[PDB]
């Protein structure tokens, strides 16, 4: 089941951004030829998208093929939506509606709060000093996630 993590990481500069694992563009299909590690979407809470196929089929290939993709459309709520990942170069990327009160792009429910997740610190380094509060809210389904707030 770990075979669905896309692993394409071209660190040709020797930055080391892969250590964490070992220790304004709208959401859409993103070809996994450009993914380095987990692809998390935040519907109202964290989910771990894996390498899928275009018809939704889960492919256990680590994202090797040209037509291995991630599917971020397919998790949108019928609401506010964002996803993140680390592309191969190690630059963090974001997809979500444009913004005040309105949420950010990828994991920013607030302009100042972030949905804390297992690879949050890897994807967002500046967020370390943020302290966490717990939240339980309906928006038809009951979600439970953690907030990392500025």
């Amino acid at each position: 089941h770990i075979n669905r993590t896309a692993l394409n990481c071209n660190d040709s500069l020797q930055t080391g951004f892969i250590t964490s694992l070992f220790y304004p563009r709208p959401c859409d299909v993103v070809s996994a030829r450009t993914v380095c590690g987990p692809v998390y979407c935040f519907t109202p809470s964290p989910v771990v998208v894996g390498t899928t196929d275009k018809l939704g089929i889960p492919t256990y290939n680590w994202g090797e093929n040209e037509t291995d993709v991630f599917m971020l459309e397919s998790l949108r709520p019928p609401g506010w939506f964002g996803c993140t990942w680390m592309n191969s170069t190690g630059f963090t990327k974001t997809c979500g509606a444009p913004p005040p009160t309105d949420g950010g792009s990828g994991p920013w429910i607030t302009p100042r709060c972030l949905v804390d997740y297992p690879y949050r610190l890897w994807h967002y380094p500046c967020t370390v000093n943020f302290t966490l509060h717990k939240v339980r809210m309906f928006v038809g389904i009951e979600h439970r996630f953690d907030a990392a707030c500025n």
């Epitope: 692993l7 660190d11 020797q14 930055t15 892969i18 250590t19 680590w62």
Partner: antibody
């Protein structure tokens, strides 16, 4: 520093399993290669392994015959060849191809190769009846 | 797909040993190494990458080459430099090494 196993003598039919003790602390992201040389012929590269992800990809010659595995409980990477021949009676070295953390590798699951700065002592294996 | 030449070399200390390492299909000059192997010892790394000297490698050894062709060179031949020299590409393949011998 890479330590290796003792010289083993095995019958041609049976398999050999030689270890490699690894020094450093980032064992999860070490990419380790095995390769050997024939008393007459030159060096040739068998394959490289990744312990944390358990992914190897090997030369065209030993793609079917050899299996590489690693166990990180003990800082050791193992090396196993089924149905030895006299062609495979040779000297077997262990080399650290690269560190995944700073390697800039792990493309498409399969690991690419980098220079092998540390090299194991080597394990001879005499394969005769 | 590495073609070394010559097979053997025989030179006297203080001479310039020049040894080629060729490729049928072009290599990215990024990934090409040289190794010094002594019997009863473990192979040693001399050049990593392209024209870069590894650590613990005297100044005499010198990498070179771009594209398909490549060369190791030594200007001061010291008397321990007479081991067999393999070249190698990463990605990975070797050549049949060259033997460096003591002219007497």
């Amino acid at each position: 520093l890479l330590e290796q196993s003792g010289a083993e003598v095995k019958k041609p039919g049976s398999s050999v399993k030689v270890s490699c003790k690894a020094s450093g602390d980032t064992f999860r992201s070490y990419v380790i290669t095995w390769a050997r040389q024939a008393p007459g012929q030159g060096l040739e590269w068998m394959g490289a392994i990744i312990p944390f992800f358990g992914t190897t990809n090997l030369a065209q010659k030993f793609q079917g015959r050899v299996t590489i595995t690693a166990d990180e409980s003990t800082k050791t990477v193992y090396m196993d060849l089924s149905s030895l021949r006299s062609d495979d009676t040779a000297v077997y070295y262990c080399a650290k191809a690269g560190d995944l953390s700073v390697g800039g590798v792990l493309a498409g699951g399969v690991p690419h190769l980098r220079h092998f700065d540390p090299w194991g002592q080597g394990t001879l294996v005499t394969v005769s009846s | 797909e590495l073609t070394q030449s010559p097979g053997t070399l025989s030179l006297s200390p203080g001479e310039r040993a020049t040894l080629s390492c060729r490729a049928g299909q072009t290599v990215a000059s990024n990934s090409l190494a040289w190794y010094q192997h002594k019997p009863g010892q473990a192979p040693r790394l001399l050049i990593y990458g392209a024209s870069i000297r590894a650590s613990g490698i005297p100044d005499r050894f010198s990498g070179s080459g771009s594209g398909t062709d490549f060369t190791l060179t030594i200007s001061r031949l010291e008397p321990e430099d007479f081991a067999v020299y393999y070249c190698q590409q990463y990605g990975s393949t070797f050549g049949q090494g060259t033997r460096l011998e003591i002219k007497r």
